[PDB]
Structures are given as C-alpha cells and as structure tokens.
Amino acid sequence: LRPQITYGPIETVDNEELTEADMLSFISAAVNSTGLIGYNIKSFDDLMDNGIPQIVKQMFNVDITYKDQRDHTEIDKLRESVQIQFNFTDVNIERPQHRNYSQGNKINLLPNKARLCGLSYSGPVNLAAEVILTAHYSNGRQEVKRASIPPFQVSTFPIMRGSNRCHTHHLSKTAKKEIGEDPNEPGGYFIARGGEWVVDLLENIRFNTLHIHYHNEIIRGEFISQPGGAFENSSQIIIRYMTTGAITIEINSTKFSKLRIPWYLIFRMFGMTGDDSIIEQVVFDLESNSLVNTFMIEILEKSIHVLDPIFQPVQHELNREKIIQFLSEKVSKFVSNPSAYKSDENAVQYLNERQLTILDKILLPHMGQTADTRVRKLRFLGLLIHKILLVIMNVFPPTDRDSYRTKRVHGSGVSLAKAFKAIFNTSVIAPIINGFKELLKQTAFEELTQRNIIEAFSAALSKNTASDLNRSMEQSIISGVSTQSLERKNLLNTISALRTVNTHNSKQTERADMMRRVHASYPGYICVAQSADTGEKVGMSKQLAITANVCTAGEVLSLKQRLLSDPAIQQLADVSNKDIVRKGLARVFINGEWIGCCTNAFELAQRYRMLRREGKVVHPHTTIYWDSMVDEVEFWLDVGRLTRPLLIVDNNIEKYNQACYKAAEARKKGDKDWEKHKIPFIQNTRFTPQMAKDILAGTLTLEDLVAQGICEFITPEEAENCLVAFSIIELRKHKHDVTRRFTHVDVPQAILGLAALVSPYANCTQPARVTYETNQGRQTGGWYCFSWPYRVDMNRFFQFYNEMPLVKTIAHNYVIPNGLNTIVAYMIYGGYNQEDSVIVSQS
Amino acid sequence: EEINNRLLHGDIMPPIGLTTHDFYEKLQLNALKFPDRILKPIMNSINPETNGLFQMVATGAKGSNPNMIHIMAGIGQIEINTQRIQPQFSFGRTLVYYPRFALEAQAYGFICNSYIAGLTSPEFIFGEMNGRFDLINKALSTSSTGYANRKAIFGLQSCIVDYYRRVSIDTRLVQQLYGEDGLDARQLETVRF
Amino acid sequence: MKICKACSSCMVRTYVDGNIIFRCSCGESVQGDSQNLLVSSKVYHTGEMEDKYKIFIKNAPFDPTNCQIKKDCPNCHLDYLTQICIGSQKIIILVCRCGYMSNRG
Amino acid sequence: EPWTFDYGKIIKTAKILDISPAVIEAIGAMEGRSYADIREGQGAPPPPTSMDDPRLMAVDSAVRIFLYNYNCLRHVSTFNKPPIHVERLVKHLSYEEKEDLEKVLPNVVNEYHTTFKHLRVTDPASALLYSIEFLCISFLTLYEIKEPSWVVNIVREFALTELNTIIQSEKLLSKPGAFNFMIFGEDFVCSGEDSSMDDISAYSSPGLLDDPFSIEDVDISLDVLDNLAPQ
Amino acid sequence: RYAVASYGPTDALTGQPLDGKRSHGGLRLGEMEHWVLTAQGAMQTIIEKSHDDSDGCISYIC
Amino acid sequence: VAGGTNKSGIVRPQEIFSAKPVEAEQSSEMLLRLKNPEVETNKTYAQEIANSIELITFERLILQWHLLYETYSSTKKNVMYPDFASDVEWMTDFLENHPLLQPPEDIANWCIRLELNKTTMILKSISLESIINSLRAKHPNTYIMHSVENTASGIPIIIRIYLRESAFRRSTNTRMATDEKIAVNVVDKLLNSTIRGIPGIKNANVVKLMRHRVDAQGKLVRLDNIYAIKTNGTNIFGAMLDDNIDPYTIVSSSIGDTMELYGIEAARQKIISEIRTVMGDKGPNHRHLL
Ligand SMILES: [Zn+2]
Ligand SMILES: [Zn+2]
C-alpha cells in the first residue's frame, strides 16, 4: 500500500522557543507509556493467558508404544504391544488459594500471608485430557479404547505479584495498603518459601539469524530456528568448515544430538540429488564468472569428495530412500539390532515415515513444518552456506557478539516457559506414562473400562507429582532462567533490579574483557554508566536506559500476508536463483523467514516505514531494517527487542533538490541571477512547545505522539539506519545544514538509567564516578519499604528522615529520594578527614 | 581538518611500512594534543597564593596537571590502547549520532569540553568508554596479579640465605652471594661517585 | 568443477600423460579441453576489493547515515555529494543519487 | 522442437511390470498414502504449480538413479570391482565382452538434464510429466532392443530390475501397514509426533583455561572484599 | 566488626576454628599472610597462630 | 594491543615468567646499532638501512595467483586457459627481449600465473627486476616469464612461473604425493620467498638514542645524536649476518633468542633487562631482579 497521509510543511513549525527543560517532558511521556517495569507484568500475563495453554495443548502430544510383557493368561500371548496416546484439551491457571483449618473450601491467599508463613504464592493449574490406548495383536488386528477426563488440578504455578492472577490486581490502592502491601510498589516478583525473587531479563542471541564465528574447525555458522512465536520449540543447525575441507551440518533439537552430517546429504534426503543443483543452491549460478563463485565452487567441490567415517556407506548414494533409511536407523534409539527389521517391509516403511516427519519439524522449522516446503528449506540452507563462505573468503567480518543488533532480552514469560517445558514432561508426562505401563501389566487390555483408564491418569498424578511441578518451578525460580533474591535496600534498588539485564552463563581472556565494556550499540537502550565498580561483576549486569522498553511479539501473519499481497514483492516460488543474481533482486525477510524478493530494497523499506507512521496498516512496534551492504530488507516483530521512542526529524530535501535543478537550468540559459532560484535547506522536528505543555497537563500521551507521526520506536538493529541528533540544540545548529540531515532527534537524558540520573550534573563529573553512584545510590539508607511494619525481614534498615535534594533530578519523579541535605564544609580541620575520612557533627 | 583536506584530495602518502589508514591515524592523534600554552588561560584565571585546587597540585599533595586541564580547559582526545575510538557501530560509524565515514575529530573520541562546562551526550559516552576500562583493569589487576604472584612465590620461596651469604635450594647454589653484594635492601644509600 | 552429463555428479580430476581426465563414480569419463586447466587460485585483499562494495557503493547516495560533503555534482549540478572512505588505503569516493561516481565508476 | 506429453508410454510400461499406471504417475507423491490407495489412484495430489514443489525433485531423483545405474552397467569394465547391482548378471560374461557393452548399448541421457531445468522453471506441471515420461521412454528403449543377440538378455533383466527398485524405493516411503513393533530390538517405540522422550536439554536455548577475573590464587576473605574497591 | 576468643566452635575434620562471624568461629590467616610472616622471619608467630591457636597437635612416629 | 605489539594486560610478563619460546612472543623487538659511528649520525642513512631490512615476502606483492596445468613451447601451440589466452601477446615480447632466457626442454605441465599489486609495488618501492632476480636466484627448478614494467593503470604486471620437471624429480620416491601436491607445495615455497628483508622482522623504525663515550681528553660525554634501528620482530642471526649492523651490540627483547645464540649468562642478563622494563620506574631494587 502507498502512504496517503500528509503533514503540514516543516518550514512552518515553530520550535524556536523549545528549551532542553521542555524536552524532559517527552521523556516523562515515554516513562508514562511503558511504566517502569510494565514489561514484566505484560510478559507474565502473556505467559498466563496465551503461553502455557498453547504449550500444553500443542507441544505435549504423547504417542508412545510399549511391549506387552504379560503371561499366557488367555489371549495375552497373541497381543504384543500397547500404544499409549493422549493429549491435553483444556488448560487454565487460577489465583493462589489456601485451605483454612482442615477440609475447608480453599479461601484466597494474600501475598502478605505467603510472606509471613513461608507459603508459596502459587495458583492452581487445571488440565483436561483425552486418552487413546491401542493394542496390537500378532495376526494383524488392533483394538482401540478411548477415554475423556474431566478437568483436574495437577499442581500450582507461581504467580508474579501484581500480575493478572494476583489478588492485588482486583484491589484498590487503599485496600492494597491495608492488607500489608506496599501501595506504591509496582510488583513484578515471585513469593516462594517466604522469600521474594526477581526473574531477571536475560540476554540471548537473536533467533532465525546466522551467527558466524571463528574457532579442527576453520569457521562455524550457527542458526537457531523457531517456527514463529515466543513459546515454540527451537532447533539449531551448526555449519562447520573443517580443516580437512569437509562441510558438516549438525542439527541439534529435541530428537537429534551432536550428529555431524555432510552438507550435501541433507540436500539428497529431500530429493535434490544432483550435485550441480546442490552446488547451485550455494553459488546461485553455475554460469557466473565472478571470483566469489570461483572461490566457493573450489571449496564446495573439494568438500564433496571428503570421506566421512560415519556416513561412508551412503556417501556416494543417489537413492534418497536409502539415505533416509540409513539416518533413521542411525538416530532412532529403539533400533538396537540392525538388519533384524529389514526383513519386514512395513517396518522399513515405518522408519522412513518417522524420519521424514521428524526432519520436516526440526530442520529450519521457521521456513515451514510441512513437506511442501522441502525445496524452500534447501534454498534457505544454501543461502546460509553462502554467507558462511563469504566470511572464510575474508570478504565479510564474523558476527559481533556484543552488538545488540543481534540480541534479545527475555523476561519472566519466556524464561518460565522454557523451565515449564523441561518440568512438565518430567513431573506430569513421565508419571502418566509409568502409570499406564503398570496398569496394562497387571490387567488385560480388553478387560479395561472407561473407569480404569480415567482412574490411572488421576491416580498416577499423586501429590508426589503435584509437589514436583510446583517445587521444580520454585527451585528454578530460586536457583537461577536467571533469577535473584529481591533485596529491598531502598525503592531505587527494587526498580533497578527489575530493569536489570543479565547475560547467560566465558573464560577466554579477550572474550571476557570485551563483554564487560560499553558497546557502541548501547546508547538509548542500555545505561552507559550503570555497572558494578568492583569484582568479577564489573560490566556483567546491565541496566535498561530510562526510555528503553522490551517489545512483545506482534501480528506476524498480518504483515506477512500484506508483503505477499504486495505487487512490489515477488514470491519465493516465482523467482529462480539465477533470477536473483542476474536481475539483482533483494531478499525480503520477516522474522528471519525468507519470503520473497524485490527489485528495490531501499524503496520498499522507505515505503513501509511511512506506512508504520500512520499505524493503521503496519504496527508501530515493527522493526524495518535495510541492509545496504548486501541489499536485504528485514522485518522483525518478535518478543525481546529493546525499543525507545525517537522524535522524527523532517526536511525539505525534495524542494531543495528541485530548486538546485532550476538554478542550474537558469545558469545554463545564460541568466545572471541564477542563484536566486535556490531555497535554503530546512530540517526540524514537529515537537512544539505547546506539545510539552499538553504532556504536563496530561492531555497528550506517547500513544498519540506516535499516532500523529511525531515520534517512533527504534530497535538497535533499526538504529543502524538512523542518524540521530544528540539534542534539540544540535538539531537547531544544523537547521540549514544540507550536509548533515538527521533522521531523528534525541533527548540527551535518554542514554542514562534510573540510578545514573540520581547524580546531579552527572556530565560535569568524571564518568567513572557516575558508575560509582549507581552502585552507591542503590545501597543507601531510606524508606526501604512503605509496608515495613507488616514484614519480618533480615538485615533491613529503615532510615527515619529523608529529604528531597535542593538540586533534584528527573529520577526523583519516579523513586523516593534517600538521604539528607547535609551542610558540608570543604576544609582541613585537624587532619581527621584525610584519606577519604569525614568529620561529623555529634549534634 | 587540514589533514582531512589532504585525505580528500589524496595528498596523504604514508611512509614505507605504514598503510594510509595507519599514517592518517598517526597524524590525527598527533594533531589533537593540547599545546603547552594551554596553561596560559588556566593560570590567568587563578591566584596561586589563594587557589586551593592549584596548591593541592603544585605541591604534590593531590592531583596532576592533566587533572586541572580536564576540569578547567578541556578533556581532549579519548585514547584507548593508544588509538582513537574505533567504529564498532555498523561499519564506519562510531555511534548513532555520527554518520558513516565521518571525518570530524569529535566522531572518534575528541572531547572539546571541560568537566566544569559539562560534556554532551556523545562526549559522555566516549568518556564512559574510557572510564569503563579503568574499572575493568582494576578488577583484572587483582586476579591477574594473584595468578602471577602465587606462581612466582612457589618457584622462588625455597631460596634462602645460608651461613655463607649464598642463596641455595637446600644444598644447591642459586647465588654465590645474595644480590652479588650480600646486603639488605633496607640498608642502602644512594651516593654519587 | 566438471559435472557428469549422465548423473549430474561432481567428477574427480586426474592427470594422465599431460592431460586432464575427469572420471565419475558411474564410470563415465571425459577430458577437459581448455576451461578445465585451472587447478587452483587465490585472490588477496578480498575485504577491500571493488567487487565487495558494488552494492554498497550503488546504495550509498540513498543511505541517510552516510557522510555528505558540500561539493557540486558535475552531472546533475546538485550542490552536495556523498563521500565514502573504503579500504586500508582510505580510498575516497564521491557518489550522487543521479548515478555520478568519482573514480569514473 | 514442440514436446507434448504421451500417456501411452506409461500405459505400455505399466503393462510390462504388471502394475497399475497409477503407480507410475505417482512417483514422488507416495508419501502419506497407503500403497493400496495409490494403486487404484485414490487421493492423487493435483499437478504442481510451484517450481519449488518437492515432487519435481523427487521424480528427477528417480530418473538419475536409473541413468547412474545404467552407466555402471554400460561402463562395467572400467570399475575395479563392479557394484553388486550389475555384477550379479555380468558375472558369466568374459572380460573381452565385459569391456564391451559401451559400444553396443545406446546412450539414453541425451537431453534430459537440459530440458528438465527449462521446464521446471517455466511450468512445473510439465516438469513432472516430462520426467515421468522420460523414465518410461528410457526403460522401453533398453527393453525394445534386438541386436546384438548376446546383449538382449542382459539388459532386459537390468531394465526390469532397475525400474522395479525405483518403484520399490518410492513404495518404501508410503504409509506402513501392520507389523510387530518390537523387531527393532527394544521395548519402547516412539513416533514422529511423540514428545514423551524429548531431550530435556533441548528446551533451553540450543548449544552453549583460567578465568581472568576470578580471584582463585588470591587468598582474601569473602567478607572483606571491599579492600579491592577501585576507590 | 568481629573479635572472638581463645576458644570456640571447631571443625570436626580439620580441628580448626569455624568460618567467620556467623558460625562464631575464628578469622583466617590465609596463604598470603604466611608468605608475609615468613618473609619477615617471624616463625614463633606462625607457631602461636597456626599451631597453638588453630589446630597444632602432637604426632607420634616410630 | 595490536598484533605484533601486544603489550596489554599481563602478556609480556607472562612471556618472561613462563619462559615462552620466541614463536609465542607477541611484542618482540630488537635494537640494531649501525656498524659505522659515522653513518649513525645521519638519519637518511639510518632510515634507508631501516627500510632495507623489512620482510617483504613475495606473497604480499600479489593480488591473485592461478595454478594452471599448462606447458610452454615457443613453437608448438600448446593449450591455454581461455581467460589468460590474451597473455600470449606479452609472451612473444618476452622471448624477443630475452634471447638468453629461452624456455628449457624440461618444462613440466604446471604453470603459476601471478598478478602483482601495483600499489604495494609503489608504496614499498619494489621494482620488477628486484622481484625477478630474487625469485630466479632462490628457485632454479622453475622458468619465469613476465610482462613489461608499465606505468599506466589498468594494464597489470603478470608474473608467470613454469615448473621444470626437475622439481618433481627432487623427491618422488615418496610416492604419497601426486604431481598436483608437489606443484601446490611449490606455490607455497615461491610465495614465501624473501624479497628485500630479513626474516622475522615486520617493521624497522629509526630511533634516536643517547650513549656515553670517553673523549680523547678522558672526559665522559653523553652523545644524544645517535641513530639506531628498533625492529618489530626478532632475528638475532638474521641481523648478525647484515653488514650494515654492528653484530656485537645486538639487543633483542627475546630471552629465547638470546639464550639460543649467546648462552645462559647472556640470557640471565636478558631476564633482568626484560623484567625491569615491565616493572616501570617505580620498580624494585636490582637484587630482586637478580
Ligand atoms: Zn556420473
Ligand atoms: Zn548528481
């Protein structure tokens, strides 16, 4: 679609009265849109309403078969196996409950009772299911028994305080205050065993992207693929280039492990067995004379004729069926004797059908999971090998591990889902599987009724399992999913702990020093000053900048269908590899999935950015990245991106360019006054002093500043297509500078976190000293909690008197100040204040 | 800027053994150093008889001359590992505030302001880059020294002065005479011949 | 490489009495005439060659993050150009959105 | 040269093998269907519309294993030891005439590869039929030869053996019947949709000598670490 | 701050004081303190602290 | 922290205390004093000697190389690669311009084609005849052809080296090496051939140093106008063979190299000198380095 809105001319915007104190209002607006920790509550609510139900109803289908190990006992000789098949149909989570006295009716459990009694602020999880048992007989017939289970409670799931499933969500501020809660705190923590725990934000690499690293391995390329969504299973491929010349593609998933396969065998298993076509997926053209192709063809050709010790029998095979059979026998763990099943033809058909089903769900699942996308995956796989060889050729550098262009920040919703998956199938699925095994061993299959099947499912899930799910989640929350105990030194520390970004858990000396530095991709997203000043943790824990936020997943289907309805984008089925290179087409990606090509990458990204400004067609939180180095357009809508609002800067470069042509045209016509046809260049932001006043009156929010096309959200990968003026004073200095045309204008205070904004005139202090204040401001005595009398806390200090600084900062609009305006004399008095000591008045 | 004008016209020719990039960086690092005359305005603004900040520095009690210059005149060029700010922000950009292949000195860590005047946002970021190293190297100076100290002590501790003033390992000579003069290091006097 | 005309496989190259013979695993053998007399090759300074920056240099006038210079374009007579500095020898190229490119490219 | 699909070649080829022509037309489309339903032709997927249809690559893969195995018989002498698929029939021949079979046998790979790459991009519907018809025409060519008399009995068996194995390989990708699940050697047998025995470590993010920052050789109390503050 | 005693809780295995304030044990004269005391030649202080005040005992050897 | 001069962190101290070999040194240096006290006064002589010793391998003068399976006979038309069939124009010129350099009778069927980097040939000031003479002197089992020294951009300078059959006759009893393996191994040897330098040293600057000397009247005077060469990289034996360097006062920063050539007593003095350099000027007493 083409953008249809128009804005008033930028030459008539009146911003000469704007002061840098007026721009602070913009920051205020930003902080009022996202709150301070609103992403934690939003992420946990997304996990509750959408995440866990999807995970249980979609990713936990059980279909297993077991040997019938009974005795003669009638027809039991003629039955060999029993097939346990079940899935869960209904899922929900309720608010935490407690049972009063004994045999009560499960009254509500408030957070303060959980804190005092050492209880668990966990709400019940109710599941429903249907189970299908199949018995297989020697002659060939089979019998099916199907049962349906009424909803039952498996365990309790921890509830984040202040979230939707918290009791302090249906209560007012006065009611919150009177039940022993801190009426001013936002929440965002878990209460387990009477302690408060913060599930921290975790740095992770970006999924559906290729990370190429140097290391026997010459080079390595890793690609984690997720079929779309925050809670789907991810499968990674590692494409190694070994010193022997061999290229091996290792696939790690829930079904494979550590098995390095020669690269061309993956192509053969999908039906592409011709080498020339296999080579064409990497070089895109066998008839190109480019020196890049000569380099790649020489490497690819040598890799085909390198002998793999494991895949020797099928290395020279052109029959795709016999390659699938070899790998299925190689990776299936129930095949303990080879050639014992090859005498049975239906068994060979079973292993081949099993491998194809597994292959289409773990090999690049983000490109599709059906069999209709096999050749599409091979085109994408060849593109990945092409990129990796471009780094071996030293054409392109490897991936920067520190840049946030290729990083994600995952909160409690994502992290608790990963812990839930590894726990649900251990504390729920595993007991049920053992439950049905022991029923079928002690009772004939045909003697069973609906009652017996329904009883075993509930009986096997005893309170051993009910405890197991809740306590395994708590241990994951406590042991740290990177978590920490919530230490309430003061209100600044509590907020700074919930805005903290932690890295996973190396020993490489250069790798250990680089990850602790401040990176050029930080300004506006990660506080440049907040870190530990001493110890191993210097630079290891990061703080969100004041206007930074964490994105949620967007409607990927709406954008994908619009890109596929775009006349400017050719679908991937309608273009050849030769067409891409001979016509110079530009690949278009959405969330890493290659969907098509366009003839003009810059024009498409420019056109969809203008569609995002209206917001009616493209969501405002959509990342639009144009790679001018390789001419690719990337759309990102996934959860975990850091964004900040930036005020849009507009110019009159269209009229300025036209006036240059008219002036040149007049000069060629012999006119003497050819210079009077030029017009001055003008660039400005549309933010006016009246907008600042409307923000403070509450009648203008960040939502309608975005809706009016005045500011927009920028992600660290989209920030590489931006030229930002560091302040409104720098934008005014270059108002008529045609040689420096900014895309956005920044508010200078947006580069600091909340604790670093406590320091007054921080730009007049040595910057390393501002790092100290972030540590020292978070360990300062004050009103550590507003509900302190209702708490029994350990090593907590409540300072009685606090003062607002005479020289305050914007950080004191969001946290209570902690300290006093002491009168200080800067003098030598007897030598008792030397070497960093002080003299205090006893009075 | 005159170095940039030479570069834009292709007038910069490196000597043998240097690339044009390395020579241009050598010229830019040398051209962006404060002269000695930077203290003329600093010293014309102060009274040495009464200024406490100057007296703490001039007498050696606390501080140095670059401390006064940074506070009062200007910080200058941020220099990490004896070189300017390298572009880690997407292939030729040092930060999001500067364009690609920017030629101005400010884009590579030149801080034109003093502390008393305050730094701008890009200057504070470049200053935070330099100040983060001081914290990283301090944390490393404990562990790296500890690894080297323990290996040096376990290699050297068996050396003990015997009754001949020799240094030996239980019988075996390490030195024929300790320090080749047989003296204690706490008992030495610096004397002119 | 050489591609087998029968099974489209990558043939193995051997040398017999001063001639190149491509033998496949299916028994088919051919002899290259002229285009197969390239045993190996390498190209140096791949990170700064003109073939690497073709797309970038073509896209440079449209990238808003690139440095501009106050200098007339001699083709369309626009009063500003986009300056880029590529390589370890710091090669300066001026480009314009009209297609002009200093160094004649 | 105007090429058109000829359905008579599949009819002729199928009658030789005593199989329904629906089996030949369903090469590369046998996954997800029981071989019974394939044989009558029920549930036949529609003709391809995309050049990235896996059906096109599957039938092309079937063609080139017929050509690859044919040249192994055609070049049986050049092999140090011929493969097992050809040696079991050329065993009784003599090395003089085993060196032969490359001058008396036709070359049936005339213009397949060049034409398939043209039709696949242009119209994927015709690519499926061209490669299906080519496999039948090539099989007939090795079947309808008459001279010399000493070679007719040696390739007609070969043509029947290869085309049967091509169909057999396609058949092994279809829906399995009923069989004992314990012949694999273990008790448990899991399916492709099962998640009961998934790797626990695979739910995390996949994948990942002295610590330079660890105070391991520094013997300092953990309660007094503020002595190391940069100050 | 901390100051303990001539006596107190003792580890069952090593026979040395427990660790720090919370266990009411002693404080640690670590590896680097014995380097400094050895460098100074103060060997009767090492006997007093590492033997008399920590775990010094009598071993009988044939 | 740059490669070849890495002195960041604790790296030089680890090289000394771990007794690491010369191959593991990331900041090795060397100070060379000119053999002539008269030459050491003038900087131009010190500068041209410093640039005289700087390892320029044949590899760093190359933009691209191709290994071709071709033989050269002047009369019979032999097959040539289609991309480089245009090279025949300067083949004929080379043969009529070098009547003494006729192609031999034992040229093998292996050819190496080279495309010299003209910018490096200008920046390093290396002539074509300097390359050709250096390659012919070191590699006698090859036949070398080249184009003219052109001063116009766009026309490259092509070095074409034909392998003689004697290259494969050197050691062919070791049958585990196909002719392609020897030919490729010949490429590696030829590329790594030394042109105008000593091996092991990367950069050789010129430094001004002050030394003491006794006058004819007995006075001791500090002479500040003395020029030396501080190299980047260590090769004592390579500098010991130079006639522009005083061999008796070669100062290497490498303990392993000093121990190798001079002995344990000089290596003892080298450990003292190298620890003191790391220690700074607020350093320990000399008896703690001893
Ligand atoms: Zn072949
Ligand atoms: Zn122009």
Side-chain angles (χ1 to χ4, degrees), chain C residues 73 75-76 78 96-98 100:
Chain C
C73 172
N75 277 9
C76 69
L78 207 65
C96 182
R97 76 176 71 248
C98 74
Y100 169 74

Side-chain angles (χ1 to χ4, degrees), chain A residues 461-505:
Chain A
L461 287 165
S462 68
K463 273 170 176 54
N464 266 324
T465 64
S467 163
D468 268 335
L469 190 146
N470 192 4
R471 307 217 155 186
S472 305
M473 294 297 315
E474 284 189 336
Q475 288 298 107
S476 176
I477 286 172
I478 290 178
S479 301
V481 194
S482 172
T483 77
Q484 60 184 354
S485 197
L486 178 73
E487 293 317 311
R488 292 181 186 262
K489 291 295 182 71
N490 46 32
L491 271 296
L492 176 60
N493 193 4
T494 300
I495 291 299
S496 170
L498 296 157
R499 292 178 70 76
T500 295
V501 176
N502 274 309
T503 78
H504 271 250
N505 280 332

